[PDB]
Design a protein around this motif. Structure first.
Motif, PDB file in Angstrom:
ATOM      1  N   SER A 142       2.249   1.929  -3.642  1.00  0.00           N
ATOM      2  CA  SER A 142       1.291   1.886  -4.729  1.00  0.00           C
ATOM      3  C   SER A 142       0.397   3.120  -4.650  1.00  0.00           C
ATOM      4  O   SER A 142       0.078   3.592  -3.562  1.00  0.00           O
ATOM      5  N   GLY A 143      -0.010   3.660  -5.785  1.00  0.00           N
ATOM      6  CA  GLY A 143      -0.886   4.832  -5.766  1.00  0.00           C
ATOM      7  C   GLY A 143      -1.500   5.128  -7.109  1.00  0.00           C
ATOM      8  O   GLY A 143      -1.338   4.344  -8.049  1.00  0.00           O
ATOM      9  N   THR A 183       0.790  -1.215   0.000  1.00  0.00           N
ATOM     10  CA  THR A 183       0.000   0.000   0.000  1.00  0.00           C
ATOM     11  C   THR A 183       0.836   1.285   0.000  1.00  0.00           C
ATOM     12  O   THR A 183       0.509   2.240  -0.703  1.00  0.00           O
ATOM     13  N   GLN A 184       1.907   1.303   0.776  1.00  0.00           N
ATOM     14  CA  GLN A 184       2.735   2.514   0.907  1.00  0.00           C
ATOM     15  C   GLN A 184       3.469   2.923  -0.387  1.00  0.00           C
ATOM     16  O   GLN A 184       3.781   4.099  -0.553  1.00  0.00           O
TER      17      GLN A 184
HETATM   18 NA    NA Z   1      -0.825   3.783  -1.475  1.00  0.00          NA
END
Ligand code: NA
Length: 97
Positions: A34-35, A31-32
């Protein structure tokens, strides 16, 4: 490394404004790293304020516009990273009204 498998709206879709955009990948996302960024590329490029979060499941990313999307053409640029650390990037375009 993840591949995009499906998205709502689909690439090249035209219709009503979606309440949210969902991207589905082949592998669990870290998650940290990926965006996504949502950009309006045309009106009948401007960044559009949007929250990006993990979906129900670790393979889904959800983009929620801060305001309803106005008529025009949009591009979602995304970045997906899994446990092997290799960043995969791509773009999905769709039209509103
Ligand atoms: Na993210």
């Amino acid at each position: 490394h993840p591949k995009l498998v499906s998205s709502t709206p689909a690439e090249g879709s035209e219709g009503a404004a979606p309440a949210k955009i969902e991207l589905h990948f082949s592998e669990n996302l870290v998650t940290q790293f990926s965006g996504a960024k949502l950009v309006m590329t045309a009106m009948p490029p401007m960044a559009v304020k949007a929250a990006v979060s993990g979906g129900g499941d670790p393979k889904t990313m959800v983009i929620t516009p801060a305001s309803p999307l106005t008529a025009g053409t949009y591009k979602v640029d995304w970045r997906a990273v899994s446990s092997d650390t290799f960043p995969i990037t791509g773009s999905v375009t769709f039209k509103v009204k």
